[PDB]
Design a binder for this molecule. Structure first.
Ligand SMILES: [Cu+2]
Length: 128
Protein backbone atom coordinates (compact mmCIF):
# COMPACT_ATOMS: atom_id res chain seq x y z
CA UNK A 1 0.00 0.00 0.00
CA UNK A 2 0.88 3.67 -0.25
CA UNK A 3 2.38 5.16 2.89
CA UNK A 4 2.23 8.90 2.42
CA UNK A 5 -0.27 11.73 2.27
CA UNK A 6 0.02 15.38 1.21
CA UNK A 7 -1.87 17.85 3.37
CA UNK A 8 -2.35 21.63 3.20
CA UNK A 9 -3.10 24.18 5.91
CA UNK A 10 -4.49 27.49 4.73
CA UNK A 11 -5.19 31.11 5.79
CA UNK A 12 -8.65 30.24 7.05
CA UNK A 13 -7.43 27.71 9.61
CA UNK A 14 -8.37 24.59 7.63
CA UNK A 15 -6.52 21.41 6.70
CA UNK A 16 -7.60 19.93 3.35
CA UNK A 17 -8.52 16.61 4.90
CA UNK A 18 -10.66 15.57 7.88
CA UNK A 19 -9.29 12.06 8.26
CA UNK A 20 -6.01 10.29 7.55
CA UNK A 21 -5.90 6.55 7.08
CA UNK A 22 -2.61 4.73 7.49
CA UNK A 23 -2.40 1.29 5.95
CA UNK A 24 -1.54 -1.25 8.63
CA UNK A 25 1.08 -2.83 6.30
CA UNK A 26 3.16 0.37 6.24
CA UNK A 27 6.41 0.29 8.21
CA UNK A 28 6.99 4.02 7.83
CA UNK A 29 4.50 6.72 6.93
CA UNK A 30 5.22 10.20 5.62
CA UNK A 31 3.19 13.37 5.93
CA UNK A 32 3.94 16.16 3.46
CA UNK A 33 2.55 19.41 4.83
CA UNK A 34 2.45 22.67 2.89
CA UNK A 35 1.04 26.16 3.42
CA UNK A 36 -0.61 27.73 0.32
CA UNK A 37 -1.62 30.79 2.34
CA UNK A 38 -0.08 34.27 2.24
CA UNK A 39 0.00 34.92 5.98
CA UNK A 40 3.23 34.71 8.03
CA UNK A 41 3.69 31.91 10.54
CA UNK A 42 3.48 34.49 13.33
CA UNK A 43 -0.29 34.75 12.95
CA UNK A 44 -1.11 31.73 10.76
CA UNK A 45 1.56 29.13 11.47
CA UNK A 46 0.55 25.50 11.06
CA UNK A 47 2.07 22.24 12.14
CA UNK A 48 0.58 18.77 11.92
CA UNK A 49 0.93 16.98 15.23
CA UNK A 50 -0.13 13.42 16.10
CA UNK A 51 -1.34 12.03 19.43
CA UNK A 52 -4.06 9.87 20.97
CA UNK A 53 -7.50 11.49 21.09
CA UNK A 54 -7.22 11.77 24.88
CA UNK A 55 -3.86 13.56 24.81
CA UNK A 56 -4.62 16.11 22.06
CA UNK A 57 -5.86 19.04 24.09
CA UNK A 58 -3.10 18.72 26.69
CA UNK A 59 -0.55 18.93 23.89
CA UNK A 60 -2.42 21.89 22.43
CA UNK A 61 -2.75 23.66 25.77
CA UNK A 62 0.88 23.26 26.87
CA UNK A 63 1.96 24.03 23.32
CA UNK A 64 0.14 27.38 23.23
CA UNK A 65 2.06 28.45 26.31
CA UNK A 66 5.41 27.57 24.72
CA UNK A 67 5.80 30.25 22.05
CA UNK A 68 6.80 30.54 18.41
CA UNK A 69 10.43 29.82 19.37
CA UNK A 70 9.40 26.28 20.28
CA UNK A 71 6.92 25.74 17.40
CA UNK A 72 4.09 25.92 19.97
CA UNK A 73 5.02 22.55 21.49
CA UNK A 74 6.03 22.01 25.10
CA UNK A 75 9.65 20.73 25.10
CA UNK A 76 10.02 16.96 25.54
CA UNK A 77 6.31 16.37 25.24
CA UNK A 78 6.11 12.57 25.44
CA UNK A 79 2.45 12.63 24.36
CA UNK A 80 3.42 13.67 20.81
CA UNK A 81 3.73 10.62 18.54
CA UNK A 82 5.15 12.52 15.58
CA UNK A 83 4.81 15.99 14.06
CA UNK A 84 5.96 18.32 11.32
CA UNK A 85 7.62 21.64 12.01
CA UNK A 86 5.49 24.78 12.27
CA UNK A 87 5.41 26.53 8.89
CA UNK A 88 4.10 29.76 7.38
CA UNK A 89 2.99 30.99 3.97
CA UNK A 90 4.67 29.26 1.03
CA UNK A 91 6.65 26.80 3.13
CA UNK A 92 6.55 23.01 3.26
CA UNK A 93 7.77 20.31 5.64
CA UNK A 94 7.71 16.52 5.61
CA UNK A 95 7.98 13.94 8.36
CA UNK A 96 8.36 10.20 8.21
CA UNK A 97 7.63 8.15 11.31
CA UNK A 98 7.59 4.52 12.43
CA UNK A 99 4.10 3.10 11.97
CA UNK A 100 4.86 0.71 14.84
CA UNK A 101 4.10 3.82 16.93
CA UNK A 102 0.42 3.39 15.97
CA UNK A 103 -1.99 0.53 16.69
CA UNK A 104 -5.25 -0.79 15.25
CA UNK A 105 -8.37 0.06 17.24
CA UNK A 106 -6.78 3.16 18.74
CA UNK A 107 -8.26 6.58 18.02
CA UNK A 108 -5.55 9.03 17.02
CA UNK A 109 -5.86 12.70 16.11
CA UNK A 110 -3.93 15.14 13.97
CA UNK A 111 -4.08 18.84 14.76
CA UNK A 112 -2.29 22.17 14.71
CA UNK A 113 -1.01 23.59 18.01
CA UNK A 114 -0.79 27.25 16.93
CA UNK A 115 -2.93 29.27 19.41
CA UNK A 116 -6.60 28.86 18.54
CA UNK A 117 -6.17 26.66 15.48
CA UNK A 118 -7.16 23.26 16.85
CA UNK A 119 -10.80 24.32 17.06
CA UNK A 120 -10.92 23.85 13.30
CA UNK A 121 -7.59 22.29 12.40
CA UNK A 122 -7.97 18.68 13.45
CA UNK A 123 -9.05 15.33 12.14
CA UNK A 124 -8.80 11.63 12.86
CA UNK A 125 -5.92 9.31 12.09
CA UNK A 126 -6.66 5.59 11.83
CA UNK A 127 -4.46 2.55 11.26
CA UNK A 128 -6.54 0.23 9.02
CU1 LIG B 1 -2.35 26.22 12.36
Amino acid sequence: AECSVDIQGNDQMQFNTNAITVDKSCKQFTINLSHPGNLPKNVMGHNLVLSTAADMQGVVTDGMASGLDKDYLKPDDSRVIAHTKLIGSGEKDSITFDVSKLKEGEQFMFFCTFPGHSALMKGTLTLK
